[PDB]
Coordinates of C-alpha atoms and ligand atoms in Angstrom, one line a residue:
Chain A
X1 CA 6.2 0.8 32.1
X2 CA 5.1 4.2 31.5
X3 CA 5.0 7.2 29.3
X4 CA 6.7 10.9 29.9
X5 CA 6.6 14.4 28.7
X6 CA 8.1 17.5 28.8
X7 CA 9.7 20.1 26.8
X8 CA 12.0 23.1 26.6
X9 CA 12.4 24.3 22.8
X10 CA 12.5 20.6 21.9
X11 CA 10.9 17.3 23.1
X12 CA 11.5 14.5 25.2
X13 CA 10.4 11.3 25.5
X14 CA 10.8 8.0 27.3
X15 CA 9.1 4.7 27.8
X16 CA 10.9 2.8 30.5
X17 CA 11.2 -0.8 30.8
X18 CA 13.4 -2.5 33.3
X19 CA 12.5 -6.3 32.1
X20 CA 14.7 -5.0 28.4
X21 CA 18.4 -4.6 29.2
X22 CA 19.0 -2.9 25.6
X23 CA 19.1 0.7 25.8
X24 CA 18.2 2.5 22.8
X25 CA 18.6 6.6 22.9
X26 CA 17.8 8.7 19.6
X27 CA 16.2 11.3 17.9
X28 CA 13.3 11.6 15.5
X29 CA 12.4 14.2 12.9
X30 CA 8.7 14.5 11.3
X31 CA 10.0 15.5 7.5
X32 CA 10.9 12.6 5.6
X33 CA 10.0 11.4 2.4
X34 CA 6.7 13.4 2.1
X35 CA 8.8 17.1 2.3
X36 CA 10.4 16.9 -1.1
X37 CA 9.8 17.7 -4.3
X38 CA 9.8 15.2 -7.3
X39 CA 13.3 16.8 -8.5
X40 CA 15.0 16.1 -4.8
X41 CA 13.9 12.2 -4.6
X42 CA 16.6 10.0 -2.8
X43 CA 18.1 13.1 -0.2
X44 CA 17.1 11.6 2.7
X45 CA 18.0 7.8 1.8
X46 CA 21.2 9.3 0.7
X47 CA 21.3 10.6 4.3
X48 CA 20.7 7.5 5.8
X49 CA 23.7 5.7 4.3
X50 CA 25.9 8.4 4.7
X51 CA 25.4 8.2 8.7
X52 CA 25.2 4.2 7.9
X53 CA 28.5 4.3 5.6
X54 CA 31.5 5.6 7.3
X55 CA 31.3 6.3 11.0
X56 CA 30.0 2.7 11.6
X57 CA 33.7 2.1 12.3
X58 CA 34.2 4.7 14.8
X59 CA 31.5 3.8 16.8
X60 CA 32.1 -0.1 17.2
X61 CA 36.2 1.0 17.8
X62 CA 35.5 4.2 20.1
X63 CA 32.5 2.7 22.5
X64 CA 30.3 0.1 21.4
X65 CA 26.5 0.8 19.8
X66 CA 24.8 -0.6 16.8
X67 CA 23.0 2.5 14.9
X68 CA 20.1 1.7 12.8
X69 CA 18.2 4.2 10.7
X70 CA 14.0 4.3 8.7
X71 CA 12.0 6.6 6.9
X72 CA 9.0 5.3 6.2
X73 CA 7.1 8.4 5.1
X74 CA 7.7 11.6 7.3
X75 CA 9.6 9.8 10.3
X76 CA 13.1 10.0 9.6
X77 CA 15.0 8.3 12.4
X78 CA 18.3 8.0 13.8
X79 CA 18.1 5.0 16.5
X80 CA 21.4 4.4 18.7
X81 CA 21.2 1.1 20.6
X82 CA 23.5 0.5 23.3
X83 CA 24.3 -1.2 26.5
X84 CA 21.9 0.0 29.5
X85 CA 24.9 1.5 31.5
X86 CA 26.7 2.8 28.1
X87 CA 23.4 5.4 27.4
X88 CA 25.4 8.9 28.0
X89 CA 28.5 7.5 25.3
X90 CA 25.4 7.2 22.6
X91 CA 24.1 10.7 22.9
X92 CA 27.2 12.3 23.4
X93 CA 28.4 10.3 19.6
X94 CA 25.0 11.7 18.4
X95 CA 25.5 15.1 19.3
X96 CA 29.2 14.8 18.0
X97 CA 27.8 13.2 14.9
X98 CA 24.5 15.7 14.1
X99 CA 25.1 19.2 16.1
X100 CA 28.8 19.5 15.3
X101 CA 29.9 18.6 12.9
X102 CA 29.0 17.4 9.6
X103 CA 31.6 19.0 7.3
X104 CA 33.9 16.2 7.6
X105 CA 31.1 13.3 7.3
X106 CA 30.2 15.5 3.7
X107 CA 33.6 14.6 1.8
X108 CA 34.0 14.2 -1.7
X109 CA 35.2 10.4 -1.9
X110 CA 32.8 9.0 1.2
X111 CA 29.8 10.7 -0.6
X112 CA 30.7 9.3 -4.3
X113 CA 30.6 5.6 -2.5
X114 CA 27.5 6.5 -0.8
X115 CA 26.3 7.9 -4.4
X116 CA 27.5 4.7 -6.0
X117 CA 26.1 2.1 -3.0
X118 CA 22.8 4.2 -3.2
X119 CA 22.8 3.3 -6.8
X120 CA 23.3 -0.3 -7.0
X121 CA 20.9 -0.7 -4.0
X122 CA 18.3 0.9 -5.6
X123 CA 18.3 -0.7 -8.9
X124 CA 18.3 -3.8 -7.1
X125 CA 15.3 -3.5 -5.7
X126 CA 13.8 -2.4 -8.9
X127 CA 14.9 -5.8 -10.1
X128 CA 13.9 -8.2 -7.6
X129 CA 11.4 -6.8 -4.9
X130 CA 8.1 -6.7 -7.0
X131 CA 5.7 -6.3 -4.4
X132 CA 7.4 -3.7 -2.4
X133 CA 7.8 -2.3 -6.2
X134 CA 3.9 -2.9 -7.0
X135 CA 3.1 -1.2 -3.7
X136 CA 5.2 2.1 -4.3
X137 CA 3.4 2.2 -7.4
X138 CA 0.2 2.0 -5.9
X139 CA 1.4 5.3 -3.5
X140 CA 2.7 7.0 -6.8
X141 CA -0.5 6.5 -8.7
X142 CA -2.9 7.2 -5.8
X143 CA -1.4 10.5 -4.9
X144 CA -1.0 12.4 -8.5
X145 CA 1.3 15.8 -7.9
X146 CA 1.4 15.4 -4.2
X147 CA 4.1 15.6 -2.1
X148 CA 2.8 12.1 -0.6
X149 CA 3.4 9.4 -3.7
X150 CA 7.2 10.2 -4.4
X151 CA 8.5 6.3 -3.4
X152 CA 11.0 6.3 0.0
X153 CA 14.3 5.5 -1.9
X154 CA 14.2 7.6 -4.8
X155 CA 13.8 7.4 -8.8
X156 CA 16.7 5.9 -10.7
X157 CA 17.1 9.5 -12.7
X158 CA 16.6 11.4 -9.4
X159 CA 19.7 10.5 -8.0
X160 CA 22.5 11.7 -10.2
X161 CA 20.8 15.2 -10.0
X162 CA 22.2 16.2 -6.5
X163 CA 25.6 16.0 -4.5
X164 CA 26.3 18.7 -2.0
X165 CA 24.1 22.0 -2.0
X166 CA 20.6 19.7 -2.0
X167 CA 21.9 17.2 1.1
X168 CA 22.9 20.6 3.1
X169 CA 20.0 22.5 2.4
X170 CA 17.4 19.6 3.4
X171 CA 20.0 19.4 6.4
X172 CA 19.3 23.1 6.7
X173 CA 15.9 23.3 5.8
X174 CA 14.4 20.1 7.9
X175 CA 16.5 19.2 10.8
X176 CA 15.1 22.0 12.8
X177 CA 14.1 22.2 16.6
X178 CA 10.5 22.1 16.3
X179 CA 9.8 18.4 14.7
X180 CA 12.5 16.9 16.5
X181 CA 12.2 14.7 19.7
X182 CA 14.6 12.3 21.4
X183 CA 13.3 8.9 22.5
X184 CA 14.4 7.1 25.5
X185 CA 13.4 3.2 25.1
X186 CA 15.1 0.8 26.7
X187 CA 15.9 0.8 30.6
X188 CA 16.4 3.8 31.3
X189 CA 14.7 5.8 34.3
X190 CA 15.9 9.4 34.5
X191 CA 19.2 10.2 32.5
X192 CA 17.2 10.6 30.0
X193 CA 14.7 13.2 31.2
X194 CA 17.5 15.4 32.6
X195 CA 20.4 15.1 30.4
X196 CA 18.4 15.8 26.7
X197 CA 17.4 19.1 27.9
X198 CA 20.9 21.2 28.6
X199 CA 21.9 25.0 28.4
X200 CA 23.4 23.9 24.7
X201 CA 23.1 20.0 24.4
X202 CA 20.6 20.2 21.7
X203 CA 20.2 20.5 17.8
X204 CA 21.3 23.9 16.6
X205 CA 19.4 25.8 14.3
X206 CA 16.2 27.0 15.8
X207 CA 13.5 27.2 13.2
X208 CA 10.5 26.3 11.7
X209 CA 9.6 24.2 8.9
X210 CA 8.5 25.1 5.7
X211 CA 4.8 24.7 4.9
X212 CA 3.2 22.6 2.2
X213 CA 0.8 24.2 -0.5
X214 CA -0.6 21.2 -1.4
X215 CA -2.2 18.9 1.6
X216 CA -2.8 15.5 0.2
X217 CA -5.4 14.1 -2.6
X218 CA -6.4 10.7 -3.6
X219 CA -7.6 10.0 -7.4
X220 CA -8.6 6.7 -8.7
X221 CA -5.6 6.3 -11.3
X222 CA -4.6 2.6 -12.5
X223 CA -0.7 1.9 -13.3
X224 CA 0.6 -1.3 -15.0
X225 CA 4.1 -2.3 -15.6
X226 CA 3.1 -5.2 -18.0
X227 CA 6.0 -7.9 -18.9
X228 CA 5.7 -11.2 -19.4
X229 CA 9.4 -12.0 -18.1
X230 CA 8.5 -12.1 -14.7
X231 CA 6.9 -15.9 -13.7
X232 CA 4.2 -14.1 -11.3
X233 CA 1.7 -11.2 -11.3
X234 CA 1.5 -8.9 -7.9
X235 CA -1.8 -6.6 -8.0
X236 CA -2.9 -4.6 -5.5
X237 CA -6.2 -2.8 -4.5
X238 CA -6.5 0.5 -2.1
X239 CA -9.4 2.8 -1.2
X240 CA -9.0 6.1 0.8
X241 CA -8.2 5.8 4.5
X242 CA -8.0 7.8 7.6
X243 CA -5.3 10.2 9.0
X244 CA -3.5 9.5 12.1
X245 CA -5.6 11.0 15.0
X246 CA -8.9 10.3 14.0
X247 CA -11.9 8.0 15.9
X248 CA -11.7 5.7 13.1
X249 CA -8.4 4.8 13.0
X250 CA -9.1 1.3 14.9
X251 CA -12.3 0.8 13.0
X252 CA -10.3 0.6 9.7
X253 CA -7.6 -1.5 11.6
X254 CA -10.5 -3.8 12.3
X255 CA -11.6 -4.6 9.1
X256 CA -8.2 -4.9 7.5
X257 CA -7.7 -7.9 10.0
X258 CA -11.8 -9.2 9.6
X259 CA -10.1 -10.8 6.2
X260 CA -6.5 -11.3 8.0
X261 CA -3.8 -12.9 5.5
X262 CA -3.7 -16.0 3.9
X263 CA -0.7 -18.8 2.6
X264 CA -1.8 -21.6 0.0
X265 CA 1.7 -23.6 1.2
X266 CA 1.0 -23.5 5.0
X267 CA -1.4 -26.1 6.1
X268 CA -1.9 -23.9 9.1
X269 CA -3.6 -20.8 6.7
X270 CA -6.0 -23.1 4.5
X271 CA -8.4 -24.0 7.2
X272 CA -9.3 -20.6 9.0
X273 CA -10.3 -17.3 8.7
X274 CA -13.4 -15.9 6.6
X275 CA -15.4 -16.9 3.9
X276 CA -13.6 -15.7 0.7
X277 CA -10.6 -18.4 2.0
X278 CA -13.1 -21.2 1.8
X279 CA -14.5 -19.9 -1.7
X280 CA -10.6 -19.7 -2.8
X281 CA -9.6 -22.9 -1.3
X282 CA -11.8 -25.2 -4.5
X283 CA -9.6 -23.9 -7.1
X284 CA -5.9 -22.8 -6.9
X285 CA -6.1 -18.8 -7.7
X286 CA -3.9 -17.0 -5.0
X287 CA -0.6 -17.4 -2.8
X288 CA -0.6 -14.2 -0.4
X289 CA -2.9 -12.0 1.1
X290 CA -2.1 -8.8 2.5
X291 CA -5.0 -6.7 4.0
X292 CA -3.3 -3.6 5.1
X293 CA -4.5 -0.3 6.7
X294 CA -2.1 2.4 6.3
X295 CA -2.2 5.7 7.9
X296 CA -0.4 8.9 7.7
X297 CA -0.3 12.1 9.4
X298 CA -2.0 13.1 6.1
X299 CA -4.3 10.7 4.5
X300 CA -4.4 7.0 5.0
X301 CA -4.9 3.8 2.2
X302 CA -6.8 1.1 3.3
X303 CA -5.8 -2.0 0.4
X304 CA -5.4 -5.6 -0.3
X305 CA -2.4 -7.5 -2.4
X306 CA -1.9 -10.7 -3.8
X307 CA 0.1 -12.5 -5.8
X308 CA -0.6 -15.2 -8.1
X309 CA 0.9 -18.3 -10.0
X310 CA -2.2 -18.7 -12.0
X311 CA -2.6 -15.7 -14.4
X312 CA -6.0 -16.5 -15.8
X313 CA -7.5 -16.5 -12.2
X314 CA -6.7 -13.2 -11.7
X315 CA -10.2 -11.6 -12.4
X316 CA -12.1 -14.3 -10.3
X317 CA -10.0 -13.6 -7.4
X318 CA -10.4 -9.5 -7.8
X319 CA -14.3 -10.2 -8.1
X320 CA -14.2 -12.1 -5.3
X321 CA -12.7 -10.3 -3.1
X322 CA -14.8 -7.4 -4.1
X323 CA -17.7 -9.0 -3.4
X324 CA -16.8 -10.3 0.1
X325 CA -15.8 -6.3 1.0
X326 CA -19.3 -5.9 -0.5
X327 CA -20.7 -8.0 1.8
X328 CA -18.8 -6.7 4.7
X329 CA -20.8 -3.4 4.8
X330 CA -24.4 -5.1 5.1
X331 CA -24.2 -8.4 7.4
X332 CA -21.4 -9.4 9.4
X333 CA -22.0 -11.8 12.4
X334 CA -21.5 -10.7 15.9
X335 CA -19.5 -14.0 15.9
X336 CA -16.6 -12.7 13.0
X337 CA -16.5 -9.0 14.6
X338 CA -16.1 -11.1 18.1
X339 CA -13.0 -13.0 16.3
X340 CA -11.4 -10.1 14.6
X341 CA -11.2 -8.4 17.5
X342 CA -9.5 -11.0 19.3
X343 CA -7.4 -11.8 16.5
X344 CA -6.5 -7.4 16.3
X345 CA -5.9 -7.6 20.5
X346 CA -3.3 -10.1 19.4
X347 CA -1.8 -8.7 16.7
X348 CA -1.1 -5.3 18.1
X349 CA -0.3 -6.7 21.1
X350 CA 2.8 -8.7 19.3
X351 CA 3.2 -5.4 17.6
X352 CA 3.9 -3.3 20.8
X353 CA 5.4 -6.3 22.7
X354 CA 8.2 -6.9 21.1
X355 CA 11.8 -6.8 23.0
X356 CA 13.1 -4.4 20.2
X357 CA 14.0 -1.6 21.6
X358 CA 14.5 0.1 18.2
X359 CA 10.8 -1.0 17.0
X360 CA 9.6 0.2 20.0
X361 CA 11.4 3.8 20.0
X362 CA 10.2 3.8 16.6
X363 CA 6.2 3.5 17.1
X364 CA 6.7 5.8 20.0
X365 CA 8.2 8.4 18.2
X366 CA 5.3 8.0 15.3
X367 CA 2.5 8.3 17.7
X368 CA 4.2 11.1 19.7
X369 CA 5.2 13.2 17.1
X370 CA 1.4 13.7 15.9
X371 CA -0.9 13.6 19.1
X372 CA 1.9 14.7 21.8
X373 CA 2.0 11.2 24.5
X374 CA 2.0 8.1 23.5
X375 CA -1.7 6.4 23.8
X376 CA -0.9 3.2 26.1
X377 CA -1.5 -0.3 25.1
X378 CA -4.4 -0.9 28.1
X379 CA -6.4 2.1 26.3
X380 CA -5.8 0.7 23.3
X381 CA -7.6 -2.3 24.6
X382 CA -10.3 -1.1 26.0
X383 CA -11.5 1.2 23.0
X384 CA -10.9 -2.2 20.8
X385 CA -13.5 -3.6 23.0
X386 CA -15.8 -0.7 22.8
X387 CA -15.8 -1.4 18.8
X388 CA -19.5 -2.7 17.9
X389 CA -21.2 -4.4 14.5
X390 CA -22.8 -0.8 14.4
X391 CA -19.6 1.4 14.2
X392 CA -18.0 -0.8 11.6
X393 CA -21.0 -1.2 9.3
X394 CA -20.8 2.5 9.8
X395 CA -17.5 2.6 8.3
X396 CA -17.4 0.1 6.3
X397 CA -20.6 2.2 4.3
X398 CA -18.8 5.5 5.0
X399 CA -15.6 4.5 3.2
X400 CA -16.3 1.2 0.9
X401 CA -19.3 1.6 -0.5
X402 CA -18.9 3.2 -3.9
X403 CA -15.8 4.7 -3.5
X404 CA -13.0 5.4 -5.6
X405 CA -10.2 3.0 -5.7
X406 CA -6.9 3.1 -7.1
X407 CA -4.8 -0.6 -9.0
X408 CA -1.2 -1.5 -9.4
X409 CA 0.4 -4.3 -11.2
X410 CA 3.1 -5.9 -12.9
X411 CA 4.2 -9.7 -14.4
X412 CA 2.0 -10.9 -16.5
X413 CA -1.2 -8.7 -16.2
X414 CA -2.9 -9.7 -19.8
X415 CA -6.0 -11.2 -18.0
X416 CA -6.6 -8.2 -15.8
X417 CA -9.8 -6.0 -16.7
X418 CA -8.7 -2.5 -16.5
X419 CA -10.8 0.1 -14.6
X420 CA -14.5 0.3 -15.4
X421 CA -15.4 -4.0 -14.8
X422 CA -13.6 -3.3 -11.4
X423 CA -14.9 -0.3 -10.0
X424 CA -18.5 -1.3 -11.1
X425 CA -17.9 -4.4 -9.3
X426 CA -18.9 -2.8 -5.6
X427 CA -22.4 -1.7 -6.5
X428 CA -23.9 -3.2 -9.4
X429 CA -24.7 -6.3 -7.2
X430 CA -28.3 -6.5 -5.4
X431 CA -28.0 -5.1 -1.9
Chain B
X1 CA -43.7 -22.3 -61.1
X2 CA -46.8 -24.8 -60.5
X3 CA -48.1 -25.2 -63.9
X4 CA -48.6 -22.9 -66.8
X5 CA -51.0 -21.1 -64.9
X6 CA -51.0 -19.3 -61.2
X7 CA -53.7 -20.7 -58.9
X8 CA -53.5 -20.8 -54.9
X9 CA -50.4 -23.3 -54.6
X10 CA -48.1 -20.9 -56.5
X11 CA -48.6 -17.9 -54.2
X12 CA -49.3 -19.8 -51.0
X13 CA -45.5 -22.1 -51.9
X14 CA -43.7 -18.3 -52.4
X15 CA -45.4 -16.8 -49.3
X16 CA -44.1 -20.0 -47.3
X17 CA -40.5 -19.8 -48.5
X18 CA -40.3 -15.9 -48.0
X19 CA -41.1 -17.0 -44.7
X20 CA -38.5 -20.3 -44.8
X21 CA -35.4 -18.7 -46.3
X22 CA -34.8 -16.4 -43.3
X23 CA -34.8 -18.8 -40.7
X24 CA -31.5 -20.4 -43.1
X25 CA -30.8 -16.7 -43.1
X26 CA -30.2 -17.2 -39.2
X27 CA -29.1 -20.4 -39.3
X28 CA -25.8 -19.4 -41.6
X29 CA -25.5 -15.9 -39.5
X30 CA -25.5 -18.4 -36.5
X31 CA -22.4 -20.0 -38.2
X32 CA -20.8 -16.5 -39.7
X33 CA -20.8 -15.0 -35.9
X34 CA -19.1 -18.7 -34.9
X35 CA -16.5 -18.2 -37.6
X36 CA -15.6 -14.7 -36.5
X37 CA -15.7 -15.5 -33.2
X38 CA -13.0 -18.4 -33.4
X39 CA -10.9 -15.9 -36.0
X40 CA -11.5 -12.6 -34.3
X41 CA -11.6 -9.2 -35.5
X42 CA -9.7 -7.1 -37.7
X43 CA -8.4 -3.3 -37.2
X44 CA -8.8 -0.2 -39.3
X45 CA -4.8 0.2 -38.9
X46 CA -4.7 -3.3 -41.4
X47 CA -2.3 -4.2 -38.4
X48 CA -2.1 -7.0 -35.7
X49 CA -4.8 -6.0 -32.5
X50 CA -3.5 -8.7 -30.1
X51 CA -1.4 -6.6 -28.6
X52 CA -4.2 -4.7 -26.5
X53 CA -7.7 -5.8 -26.3
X54 CA -10.8 -4.8 -24.5
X55 CA -13.9 -6.5 -23.0
Ligands
PGT501 C1 -25.2 -6.2 -29.5 C2 -24.6 -7.5 -28.6 C3 -26.1 -7.4 -27.4 C4 -27.1 -7.7 -27.9 C5 -28.1 -7.6 -26.4 C6 -27.9 -9.7 -25.7 C7 -29.0 -10.3 -25.5 C8 -28.0 -11.0 -24.1 C9 -28.1 -10.0 -22.8 C10 -27.1 -10.9 -22.4 C11 -26.7 -10.4 -20.6 C12 -25.8 -8.7 -20.9 C13 -27.4 -8.1 -20.4 C14 -26.5 -7.2 -19.0 C15 -25.4 -8.1 -18.1 C16 -24.9 -7.0 -17.1 C17 -23.4 -7.8 -16.7 C18 -23.6 -9.1 -16.2 O1 -24.9 -9.2 -15.5 O2 -22.6 -9.7 -15.9 C19 -21.6 -9.5 -14.6 C20 -21.9 -10.4 -13.7 O3 -22.1 -10.5 -12.3 C21 -22.2 -10.9 -11.1 O4 -21.8 -12.0 -11.4 C22 -22.8 -10.3 -9.8 C23 -24.3 -9.1 -10.7 C24 -25.5 -10.0 -10.4 C25 -25.8 -10.7 -9.2 C26 -27.3 -10.1 -8.7 C27 -28.2 -10.5 -9.8 C28 -29.8 -9.5 -9.5 C29 -30.7 -10.2 -10.3 C30 -30.5 -10.5 -11.6 C31 -31.7 -10.9 -12.4 C32 -31.6 -11.8 -14.1 C33 -31.1 -12.7 -14.1 C34 -30.0 -13.4 -15.1 C35 -28.8 -12.6 -15.6 C36 -28.1 -13.1 -16.7 C37 -20.1 -9.5 -14.8 O5 -19.5 -8.4 -14.3 P1 -19.1 -8.9 -12.6 O6 -19.8 -7.6 -11.9 O7 -18.8 -10.0 -12.4 O8 -17.4 -8.0 -13.0 C38 -16.6 -8.6 -14.0 C39 -15.3 -9.5 -12.6 O9 -14.5 -8.6 -13.1 C40 -15.6 -10.7 -12.7 O10 -16.8 -11.4 -12.3
PEF502 C1 -31.7 -5.8 -22.9 C2 -31.3 -4.1 -22.4 C3 -30.9 -3.8 -23.8 C4 -29.4 -4.4 -24.3 C5 -28.3 -4.1 -23.0 C6 -27.9 -2.6 -22.9 C7 -27.1 -2.4 -21.8 C8 -27.8 -2.4 -20.4 C9 -26.5 -2.4 -19.5 C10 -25.8 -3.2 -19.4 C11 -24.9 -2.6 -18.7 C12 -24.6 -3.4 -17.3 O1 -25.8 -3.7 -17.0 O2 -24.0 -2.8 -16.2 C13 -23.5 -1.8 -16.2 C14 -24.3 -0.9 -15.0 C15 -23.7 0.0 -14.5 O3 -23.7 -0.3 -12.6 P1 -22.5 0.4 -12.1 O4 -21.5 -0.2 -12.0 O5 -22.4 2.3 -12.2 O6 -23.2 0.6 -10.6 C16 -24.1 1.6 -10.5 C17 -25.5 1.0 -10.4 N1 -25.4 -0.2 -9.0 O7 -25.0 -1.9 -14.2 C18 -26.6 -2.4 -14.5 O8 -26.7 -1.7 -15.2 C19 -27.0 -3.2 -13.5 C20 -28.3 -3.7 -14.6 C21 -28.2 -5.3 -14.4 C22 -29.1 -5.8 -15.8 C23 -29.4 -7.6 -15.5 C24 -30.4 -7.8 -16.4 C25 -31.8 -7.4 -16.1 C26 -32.8 -8.2 -16.7 C27 -34.3 -7.4 -16.4 C28 -35.7 -8.7 -16.1 C29 -35.1 -9.7 -15.7 C30 -36.5 -10.5 -15.5
HEM503 C1 -26.1 -10.4 -43.3 C2 -26.1 -10.9 -42.1 C3 -24.4 -10.6 -41.2 C4 -24.6 -10.4 -40.2 C5 -25.6 -10.3 -39.0 C6 -23.2 -9.9 -40.2 C7 -22.3 -10.0 -38.7 C8 -21.2 -9.3 -38.6 C9 -20.8 -9.5 -37.4 C10 -20.7 -9.3 -35.7 C11 -19.3 -9.2 -38.0 C12 -18.2 -8.9 -36.5 C13 -17.9 -7.0 -36.5 C14 -18.9 -6.3 -36.9 O1 -19.9 -6.2 -35.8 O2 -19.3 -6.2 -37.7 C15 -19.2 -9.3 -38.9 C16 -17.9 -9.0 -39.4 C17 -17.7 -9.4 -41.1 N1 -18.7 -9.6 -41.5 FE1 -20.3 -10.1 -41.4 N2 -22.8 -10.5 -41.1 C18 -23.4 -10.6 -42.1 C19 -23.0 -10.4 -43.2 C20 -22.0 -10.5 -43.8 C21 -21.7 -10.6 -45.5 C22 -22.8 -10.8 -46.3 C23 -20.7 -10.7 -45.8 C24 -19.8 -10.6 -47.0 C25 -19.1 -9.5 -47.9 C26 -20.2 -9.8 -44.3 C27 -18.5 -10.1 -44.2 C28 -17.6 -9.7 -43.1 C29 -16.7 -9.4 -42.9 C30 -15.6 -9.7 -44.1 C31 -16.5 -9.2 -41.6 C32 -15.2 -8.8 -40.9 C33 -15.5 -7.8 -39.8 C34 -13.8 -7.8 -38.9 O3 -13.1 -7.6 -39.2 O4 -14.0 -8.5 -38.2 N3 -20.7 -10.3 -43.3 N4 -20.3 -9.8 -39.5

């Protein structure tokens, strides 16, 4: 496995892997949910559904290929999987889809059907999925009045205020030749390297992406969605993280991995880990853990999430988690760091070793749209091994000791102290 | 009043009881706070206060 790079007007990337036999080729745009004003929120989701809606029959009829999509914060990706010997067909279909012509794909009936389907889907998401809801609310409350807080699926009222003008405007303003790459993950050697760059076989509308007046921000805002009908209580915490291409990415990832995950209803999860697991097992407080270290091109979010059937025990859980975070920055045994390093090595190996071509293409585009070339796994392992106790202690002291935090919650949140009791528990303790 | 006159016992017992009664004040105030904590506190609005509370 190796990475190649080249450019003429556009950028072309490829990570050949002859072991797998599922070639996937598609484009990736560096403009998603972070490049849209709050009055135009679900335009990217409408694009995704309108490319997943109607021509999905044509792709399976005329040829054989399964087409996917993904929008996370700015990486609007349209991957077209295929068989190893049928990549040119996928590229030709992608060209006939984007560059010419999208007028047929933009009709009144098709758009109305996509609109009602998207409305039903977003309503269902807002009804059922609670942890994702609290994650989106944490994002929307940490980045108040900033093009990084609005959700990636579109607020309910924002959908029905845009039909054909906003969608085409987004296409003409973001689907450009400056922030687009052509991934080639699979088992293709050099056809992607040559056919992507042609006299006219590239996206039209040469130009530049509009600049953003506001880069990012982070203020400690609290949001609650108290409602006693739900049985459980989902709460999330976060602090300021680091963006991609910073010499703190892997240290933050290791700090997240130190505490790891947990699941009380699994016999293999109650007997491992670090101290807070032991402190929690004595009384049934929590059910799930998710120590996440998210990073975006502007700013990151290193946080925590949980969900408890017990409602009176929320304060104790939050206090114990904050106390453990406090202990992280003063005294960590070298054994803890070694175990966290091994666990993170395994985790990144699983993440970057999965046989899915689509996930590898997504990661490749994500890491190439910011730096220019993907950071290989061997170098990643070497620099992971470079980390020591001093570096993680320094990062924890810099980014955790008495820093502004954001909180979110929903369900039975009657027993959650609002903002000063939680914030005070990071420096009031004897040090 | 310790007889028809005033002597050492009268003023001494008066001082002792002025010393002692505030202890009964303290005990009954303890009872007052116990009842308060059991039944909670009211609001200037003259309406229910269980909707929102703070430590
Ligand atoms: C007008 C009414 C009051 C009149 C006067 C009252 C007189 C009695 C005073 C009683 C104590 C109150 C004085 C101030 C106490 C500060 C708060 C405190 O100690 O309690 C915290 C307890 O804090 C801790 O448990 C950690 C800090 C203590 C560890 C460090 C100790 C240092 C040395 C202490 C010496 C004193 C020992 C006796 C303390 C009672 C609660 O907050 P938390 O950090 O737990 O946050 C809440 C969280 O969500 C749930 O935990
Ligand atoms: C008696 C005094 C009069 C009655 C109390 C009046 C209020 C006092 C402060 C209460 C707020 C509070 O104790 O905690 C809120 C503040 C906020 O600290 P912080 O969150 O801004 O973090 C910034 C600082 N790291 O922390 C404290 O001061 C902690 C003080 C702990 C005192 C414990 C008792 C000490 C006894 C001394 C003798 C021991 C023998
Ligand atoms: C003299 C010693 C007393 C002490 C230390 C005391 C203390 C308190 C305290 C702490 C409260 C809770 C609200 C607040 O802090 O004010 C309270 C409430 C109250 N007290 Fe007292 N009290 C005393 C005397 C009295 C007396 C003599 C009355 C008689 C009229 C009284 C009637 C009340 C009432 C009606 C409330 C209700 C306030 C609320 O709605 O919570 N108290 N008292």
